[PDB]
Every structure is written in C-alpha cells, then in structure tokens.
Amino acid sequence: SAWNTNLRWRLPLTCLLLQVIMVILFGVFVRYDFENEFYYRYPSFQDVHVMVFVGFGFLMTFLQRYGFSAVGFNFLLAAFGIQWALLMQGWFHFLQDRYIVVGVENLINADFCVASVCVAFGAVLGKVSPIQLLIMTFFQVTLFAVNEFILLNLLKVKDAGGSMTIHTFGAYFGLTVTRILYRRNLEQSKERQNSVYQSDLFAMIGTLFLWMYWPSFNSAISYHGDSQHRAAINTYCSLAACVLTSVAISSALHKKGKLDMVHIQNATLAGGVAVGTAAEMMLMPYGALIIGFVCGIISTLGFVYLTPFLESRLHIQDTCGINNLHGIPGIIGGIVGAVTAASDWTARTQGKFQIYGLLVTLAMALMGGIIVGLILRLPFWGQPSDENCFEDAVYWEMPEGNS
Amino acid sequence: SAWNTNLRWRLPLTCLLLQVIMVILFGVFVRYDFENEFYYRYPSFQDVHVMVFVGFGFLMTFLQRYGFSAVGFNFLLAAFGIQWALLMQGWFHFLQDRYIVVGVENLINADFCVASVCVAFGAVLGKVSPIQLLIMTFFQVTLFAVNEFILLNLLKVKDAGGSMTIHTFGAYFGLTVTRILYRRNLEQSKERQNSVYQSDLFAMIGTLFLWMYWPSFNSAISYHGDSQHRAAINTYCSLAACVLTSVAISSALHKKGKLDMVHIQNATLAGGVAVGTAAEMMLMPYGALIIGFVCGIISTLGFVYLTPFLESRLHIQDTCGINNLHGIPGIIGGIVGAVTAASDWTARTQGKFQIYGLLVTLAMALMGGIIVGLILRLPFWGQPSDENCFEDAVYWEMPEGNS
Amino acid sequence: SAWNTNLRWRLPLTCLLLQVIMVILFGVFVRYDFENEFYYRYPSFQDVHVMVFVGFGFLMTFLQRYGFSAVGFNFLLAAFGIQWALLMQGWFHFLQDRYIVVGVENLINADFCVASVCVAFGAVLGKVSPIQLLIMTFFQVTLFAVNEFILLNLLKVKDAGGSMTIHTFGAYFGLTVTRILYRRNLEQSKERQNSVYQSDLFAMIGTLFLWMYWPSFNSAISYHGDSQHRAAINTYCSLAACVLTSVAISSALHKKGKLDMVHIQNATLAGGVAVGTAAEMMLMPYGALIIGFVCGIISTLGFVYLTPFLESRLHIQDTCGINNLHGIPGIIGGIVGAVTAASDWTARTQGKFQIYGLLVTLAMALMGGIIVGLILRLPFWGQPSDENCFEDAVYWEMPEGNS
Ligand SMILES: CCCCCCCCO[C@@H]1O[C@H](CO)[C@@H](O)[C@H](O)[C@H]1O
Ligand SMILES: CCCCCCCCO[C@@H]1O[C@H](CO)[C@@H](O)[C@H](O)[C@H]1O
Numbered sequence A, B, C: 001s002a003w004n005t006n007l008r009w010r011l012p013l014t015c016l017l018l019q020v021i022m023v024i025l026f027g028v029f030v031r032y033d034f035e036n037e038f039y040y041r042y043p044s045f046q047d048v049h050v051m052v053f054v055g056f057g058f059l060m061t062f063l064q065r066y067g068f069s070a071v072g073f074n075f076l077l078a079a080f081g082i083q084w085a086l087l088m089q090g091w092f093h094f095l096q097d098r099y100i101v102v103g104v105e106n107l108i109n110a111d112f113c114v115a116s117v118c119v120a121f122g123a124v125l126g127k128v129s130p131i132q133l134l135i136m137t138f139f140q141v142t143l144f145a146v147n148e149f150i151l152l153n154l155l156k157v158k159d160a161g162g163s164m165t166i167h168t169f170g171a172y173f174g175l176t177v178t179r180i181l182y183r184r185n186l187e188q189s190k191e192r193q194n195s196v197y198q199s200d201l202f203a204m205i206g207t208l209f210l211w212m213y214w215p216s217f218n219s220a221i222s223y224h225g226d227s228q229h230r231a232a233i234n235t236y237c238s239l240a241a242c243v244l245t246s247v248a249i250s251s252a253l254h255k256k257g258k259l260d261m262v263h264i265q266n267a268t269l270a271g272g273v274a275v276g277t278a279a280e281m282m283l284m285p286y287g288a289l290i291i292g293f294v295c296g297i298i299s300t301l302g303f304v305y306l307t308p309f310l311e312s313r314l315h316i317q318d319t320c321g322i323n324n325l326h327g328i329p330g331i332i333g334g335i336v337g338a339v340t341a342a343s344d345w346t347a348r349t350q351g352k353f354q355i356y357g358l359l360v361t362l363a364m365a366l367m368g369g370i371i372v373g374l375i376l377r378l379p380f381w382g383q384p385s386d387e388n389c390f391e392d393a394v395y396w397e398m399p400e401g402n403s
C-alpha cells in the first residue's frame, strides 16, 4: 500500500541484497598490492571522510524533528555508497582487464563520489525513505562514475575539488529528482520544516567541520605538491571571504539587521565549492578572495529570493537549499575554472573543454535525475505522506525518555 | 556511611594522591631521547586520542541525565589512565634496567590501554562513583599491561587492533565487575536508563568519530607500511558492511520496521572490533566485508535478545551493551585472527597460539574482574543507591539556567 | 541612537569594507612561490585550525541563550582575523621590500594570532556586538603582530606555544577592554549568564577538541623535530595532570563535593597554557606534570574566589573567566619559560630577556586595551543594554520551531 511506511521487510531486503552483491563483487574484482602513498595521502583521505560522515551528516540535522534521519540516513547511504563507488570508479581502471587494485587513492575518490550523493540528499531531505536513498545512491554513484570518466579521461578536463563532478552534478541531479518527486501538499508538514535552537547548534558542528577541512577536500587529488599547497591556501582564503559577505548579506536582507542561521550554516561554505576547479590553478590568492566574496553574496541572495521563487513558480522543493550552495556556486566554479584554465591556443582549447565538461555534467545530471526520479516516484518504497514529512517517528523508534 | 555520596574529602584525596604518585614515578623513571617517528606516527596517535576522549566520551552521553558523568568521568579516568599506562607498559621496556624512554609510540599504546578501560566503563556506566572508576582504572591498566605482555612477548601473538587485548579484555573485565556489583533494585532507576532526542544526537558524535577514525586505530601499530595500508582499508570495508547489516537487523526486529538509535550508535561499530586482529593479516577485502556483515547482525541480535537474557537470567547489568559490541565481536575477532594467522606448520602453530592468547585474555579478565569487583563493592567509595543511578545530580552541581 | 541594536546598515558596511580592503591588500602584497613544508606542517595547521573554530567556538556556547553568537561571532571574527593576520604578520617578513610570500607556515601563525582574539572574546562575550568584535579583531591582530615582532625578533625570546604572545597577551588585552566596558547594571542580565544542561554538553565539544589538539598547538612552530616531539609530550602530560587537580579542587571547594562544569570545561585546559613557552625546553616530563598539577589548582581557585573578587572589587566582568585559564596560567607559563631557559651566562641572559618579553607583553596588552576599549565604548556600534546581555535574539532571527 502507498500509505504503508512499515519497512520491516523492504529495508532489510534492500540492505542485505545490496551488501551481499558488494561482497560477491569485491570477491571477484577487488585486490591489494603485494615513502608509501598511505603516509602522504591517508591524512587527506581522513579529512574528506570527516566531511562526508560528520560534515554533511550534522549539517542536515538543523531540522527540528529530522535529526536522526539526517545523520543516520547519511551514515547509511554513505556506508553503502563508498563500497559501490570503489567498484564503479574502479571498473574504469581495471588491471589485467579484471582487477581493481585498491589503495588509499581509491578510498579518497570513493568518498568524493559519495559527497555528490550527500549533496543530492540535501534537496530531498525529509521527504524520502531510506530505501529511496539507497536506490538513489546506487544509480547516482554509477552516473557520477560515468560523468567523471567522460570529463577526466575523454575530455581531459581538470576539476580537483569537484565544482562540476561533485557539486554541480550532485545539485542538479538532486534538484531534478526533487522536481519529479514534487509534493503538492507539502505545506501540511511545514510546521516541522524548520529548526529549533538546539538543532541549529548541532548543525554548526556540520558547518564547521566542512569549512575547516575544505582546504583538504580541494587539494587531496591535486597531483604536484606545488599545486596542492596552492589549492589548500586558495580554498582557505575563498572560505574566509565567503563568511564576511554571507554575514553582511544575511544582515542586509533582514528588516532588523538580524542574522539567520540558515545563511551562517550554508552560505559560508559557497566559497569552497566555487574554487573547487580553480583552486589548484590560481597563481594569486586575491582572486580566491574575490570568488569567496561574490559567492557568499550570491548564495545568501539565493536562500532569501531564489529558493522561494523556484519552489513557488517552478515546483522545486529544495530542503537544504542545495541550489544556493552546491548548484549555482558549482556552475560559477566551473566557469571560473575555464577562464583560469585559458589564462596560448592550448590554453584557449583547455578553456573550451572545461566548458564542455560543465555542459556534459549538467546533461548527465538532468537525464540521470529524470530516470532516477521516475523510479523513486513509484509508490513501492515506503515514502511518507505529504503531512508526515520531516518527522523521524516515521522511521525511528522515538526515545523512551521522551515517550 | 554507605548512603553518603558526598565526595568532598574522598575524591580530592583520590585524585591528588594518584597524581602525586604519577609525579614521583615520572621523576624516577621517565625520560626523553637526546625522518622522525613523531612525523610518521603522531597522526595515528591523534586519531586514537580522539577516539578515547571524544569517541567513547560522547558515545556514552546517550543517557538522558548522565551526560556530564559520561563525558566527564571518561575524561577523568582517561587523563589518569594515560599517565599510569605509560608507566605500566613502560616497565615492560626498561632501558638501563630503570628508565622508560617515552616517544609518540608510548603515547599511542597508553591510549590503547585506556581504551580498554573506556570499554569496561560501558558496563558499569551510571552505577559507579568517579572514585570507583579511578580505582578500576588503576588496577585495569596494570592487568591490561600484564595481559599484553603475556600475549605479545611471551606467546608472540599478533593483535594490532586489540580484538583480544582491548575489546575482549575490556568487555569481560567490565562485565565481571558489573556482575559482582549487581544491583537487585536497579529497576528503581530505570526511568533514567534511556535517552531523550537530544542525548541520542550527542551520542552520534561519539559514534561517528569512532567509526571514521577506526581505520587508524586498527593500523596504528602495524609495523610494515604494507600491512598498515591493508589494516586501514580492511577496517574501512568491515565497518561499511556492518552499517548495512546493523540497519537491516534493527529494522527486521522491530514490529513496525523502525530503527533504534542504540543499534545505529553501537552495532555499527562491531565490524571495527571484529577485524582488530585480522585486519593487518587479510590479503583480500571481501573477507573484511563478510566479517562486518556477520558482526552487524550478531551485535544487533545481542542488543535485542542477549542483553535482556543476560540481565534477567545471569544478573549481568550492562549499561552500554558492551557484550554486543566489544565482547562477542572481540572473541570473533580473536577467532578470525587465529584462522587468518594459520592460513605451513609455523602457520598452524601461530594459529594455536592466537587461540592461547584469547583464552589467556579471558582468564585475566575474569580473575582480574573478580578481584577488582570485590574491592569496588566495598561501601567506602560513594556509589549511589539503587534508585539514584543514571543521575548526574548525585556528583555534579546542576546548571543554574535549569534550577 | 545608543539603544539601537539594528545592524542592518552598520554590520554589512563593516563586513564589506573590511573584506574589500583585504582583497585590495592581498592583490598588492600577497603571492605564492613558483619534501614540501605542506606535507610536514599542514597537519599541525589543521589541528590549530580546529582549536580556533571548533575549540574556542563551542567552548563559549555554555551560555544558555548565547550559543549562536558564541560559535557564530567566533566564526566571523576568526574568518576576518586570519586574513588580516596574514598581512600584519606578513609585513614583518616582506620579500623584495613589498611581497608577502604565503605558505602553510603563514597560515599556522595567522591562526595563532587569531587564537589571542578568541581568548579576549572570552572576557567580553555576551556584552558586545559583532561590529565591536570586528573592530577589536582589527586592532588586536595589529597589536599581536607588533608584540610578537618585539619579542621574537628584537628580544630573541622563545615562546613556541604562546604563553606570552597568545594567552597572557590575549587575556590582559581582553580584560583591559572589558574593564573599560564595565556595565554597572549587568545584574539585570544575570538570569542568562549561566548554562543549561544541553549547553554544557555542547561546550564540552569545545573543551575536548582544545585539550586533545593542544599538544600540536604547543609544538607546531618548534623548529627541530627533537624539540617538537618534546613539546607535544610535555603538553600531553601537563594537560593530564591538570584534569586530576582541577577535578580535585572543584570537588573540594563544593559543600557537597560536587563537580562544576565551568571547572571541567576550562580549568582542565590550564596545563596547556602554562607549558606553552617551556614545553619545547623541558628535558624531563615530570616537570610538565608538576606545572599541570599546580595550574589545575590555581585555575580552579581563580574561578571560585578570584573571578567574584575581581568583578566585585575591581569591576572586571570576565564572562568566560579568561583570567583563570589564559591570564594567570599565561604569566606562570612565561615565568616557567624564563626559569627553564636559564637552566651559563648566555642561559642566564636568555632568562632575563624571557622576563622582558613577559613585561613587554603586559604593557602592550594594557596600553592597547585602553585604546581599543575607549573606541569600543563609543555608543555607535549597536551594543546591547545592560538588561539585554547574553541574549542571541538581539542579533539573530530565532528558530521558527521555537517561535
Ligand atoms: C565570482 C567571479 C569573480 C571574478 C573571478 C575572480 C578573479 C580571478 O582571479 C584571478 O586569479 C589569477 C591567478 O591565476 C590572477 O592572475 C588574476 O589577476 C586574478 O584576477
Ligand atoms: C565472521 C565470520 C565470517 C567468516 C570470515 C570471513 C572470511 C575470511 O576472509 C578470508 O580472507 C582471506 C585473506 O587473507 C582470503 O584469502 C579468503 O579467501 C577469505 O575467505
């Protein structure tokens, strides 16, 4: 029944089937080799790992009665996704036409891949079952891997910090999915689509770990040590500038000049997304400050004006405002990456192909999102009703100390 | 008086005596030497350090009115324990028959030793005074050091991630202690032996830092870089698989298919414990996925069925269900370590001695737990009454903003 | 109007002006170079980065209705401060009489500089607007840079962990500022100048990340690997001993022997501050244990007896008791640094100049604090009234789920 949110058969079936398949496929394909890349790369892996599980995980706990599902479903989707990503990204790097040799570099890329699903989760947060999220993860990891392969291998595009492959891709995939999953009577749940004091403090845990570790995120897969150092510092600068302009615009747009925690939790991160592609390329930090400057402003304007417009007029219900953080700043990051790439004819042509990568990313996000959206819209997955969204009690036993 | 929980003389006396003794013993024995092991090992130290103080610390804050004592007593017991561990573990490595030369490697092992006490704390949490915890730490660190010496030095057993030396040892020591400390009327406090919404979110801080950093935990003291890399990735895999099966079984065992935060906070960590010994030995990741697969299932079944049975029929009151996370998966880890070790005659004999190490660990945990249990049962230490357990107000001034 | 806390023009103006100036000055002066210092130093940078944004940020969230402003204003002041510090500290290291070449070492020092402002923020927390904090940061970063230059370059003083340059300087600057900003009717807000249960748990996030990462804080800029290793372990020891004596004295001073979370959150950190200067110099760990031993006691006595006395008799309103953590232990750290430095004539003279550095730091903190205090006291900045302190609602839109 379409009203049945009882997942006692379906969720275990989905989890166990997926995990058995992971076991079989690891047995067939995945192997180990027999100073280290471990020592020089593991620290970057850990920072990205924290951003996925604690950064995105707690960021989404701002919802007053959706904290368990935010951190807990993120935990679940990412635990599955990292395994499936190792395989999908792996298959584009077979050794002996049949082995995926895994090292720390594979783990780093698997977490980046999953980060795109954490982005998409932000659009549909509160309105989808954990079964829908696992199905989304299954298809989105595949699509991410194919898009990444087209960009990095076929088009020879550079995108170290994933403004295109992670943020633009994840955002517009997520937003396409959420549009297909449009809920006409979502206002029936709107009393829970907000924060309470304590949930905004938990969410700042997420914000701060993303913001602090983003310089590793953007530098982890830069190749030369020289560009890695530059990627990190440019990201650090862009993020710093983003905080001041996000705060400035949050205040400016409020009638009493008061700040809004949605802006401080989310718009302050836009400078990280926007230098994903360019951070490793920019020879001077002042440009990174400008990117952070502009994107804090644009992100905050997006939350205030664009989100309500897109929901009202275009039927895009975007719980975490991922369009304002990952989407628009992702596209900006892609464009700035192209311009920075172009700065002889070989430079000019690199610039054009960076743009090709952006357009390919968007096409894949749209087409992929339509397909996955339509699958997720089927009434089989235990999704809640329009008046039961943003409510943990639908999928969790609620604490005994409360009830 | 046995009803007197006023620690104004006894707690300061205990803290100051212990710390003065640490000062004297450091003065006599502890010295420094006069790329670096600092650079290559300090990062692993920090990850383990976080798991001890923030991981276990916040994990135990799920108790609705025991958050201060959970994080705060963990802080206190570990601050003492790391110092005493440096000495106890140190004495088994005298230089010049009388000096303990400390480097980062000593700090790593001291934190591992204390992790075993954090495990044991999980069984007695809410029912013991901070004085009892310091006394427990004093004796348990000593017992840990002797057990570790027997296993690693005398039996030449391998246990990089401590499935035996930390988890099995800590769990069955803790459970033996809690059995001796059995409280006939504990149901009088049962209204506080649970979570509220916000305490389950704080506890997820603990869960996630343990889960994310466990790959360092299991690889920190692996010797070759080759096995270290393998230890980390096998742990990462086992933990991933553990989340999916823990979630599957939590749902399956609920009448409405709903998830339980006790399972998501604790059973999701069982795959880390279970590959402690084998992670560095397993040449293929698919085996690690299987270990995580099985242990998520077993851990969750333990929480639902074994914990109530052991409390009902065997009088084992296990606050954090450490038997389900550290105990059974610890023994499994020890057994899988033996089988993996055995996979010529030298391999076969290594296998048998791994099993000897498991049996020795259990014997030490039982005998040590009986002795320490009986000391802790003495009415001198300011332990609370059966109707005043899981209540911070017994040992803390409660916030002025509330009262 | 002096009663006008509406920052809709003033806060955006302040943020945008400051950030545009940062952009211009980075464009003129700041450049990049064209194994790595990145690899060996970035990890230490990250630990310090976490201490600034999450450590100090969450530490100050103990205030029951000031959690947003504590973590959020810290975020804002530090985001500005790191940029301005890169410039101010940079100008004392021009290349080509006009370029600041930034690497990871610059980022580490910029975060240390900002840490001093996080300290000062602790005195004025709850009673100053975000505009006052940005103005304070602007001047305090400049003063920090000049004081650091006098000490390190002109006086050839050693202070790796900043007992003088960060803690003593920050504390007495902050306390001078707060004295000039004395509020006669602050008791009108005293119902919010306290914690609730959940705010004390958030604050422990801050406490624990400071405590765990402090060994990196104190070793990050030690030059030789030998002294770095020593700085870290001495800090680890001092902090451990500090917890036991802080707990002992918290209990001893309570009529019922109960612990106070103010002491466990703050006094437990005093051993880190007190070995800032000496940690890299002390050849034996037992001395570090003694410093932590004494400073836990002194810090806790300060919270109980000195804070109320200084507020009552000397009109020093110190929200976070920074005198007890950063001030007195900072001066102790400076004194122990001198004695440790002195332990031939060249050693003796180093000792005297360490003391000169302490006296210069205090003079700069006082003079600088008077000037900045008087500027901040002007009624232009949107500071709240005496009955509206420690209240987020003054500067933030409050969560919709509550209102
Ligand atoms: C969001 C759009 C803002 C405009 C982009 C910021 C300016 C680009 O930054 C550029 O960095 C280069 C480093 O390679 C410098 O050579 C250029 O002078 C600088 O303009
Ligand atoms: C919890 C018990 C589950 C059974 C143990 C998991 C299977 C052991 O994993 C083993 O790893 C080895 C790597 O050295 C491989 O060679 C073996 O093929 C594989 O079975």
Ligand SMILES: CCCCCCCCO[C@@H]1O[C@H](CO)[C@@H](O)[C@H](O)[C@H]1O
Binding pocket: C281, C282, C283, C284, C286, C287, C288, C290, C291, C294, C295, C332, C336, C340, C343
């Ligand atoms: C807070 C004041 C407490 C007194 C200071 C602690 C003692 C100083 O510690 C000193 O460390 C030296 C290492 O260089 C040792 O040589 C000395 O024996 C030891 O006393």
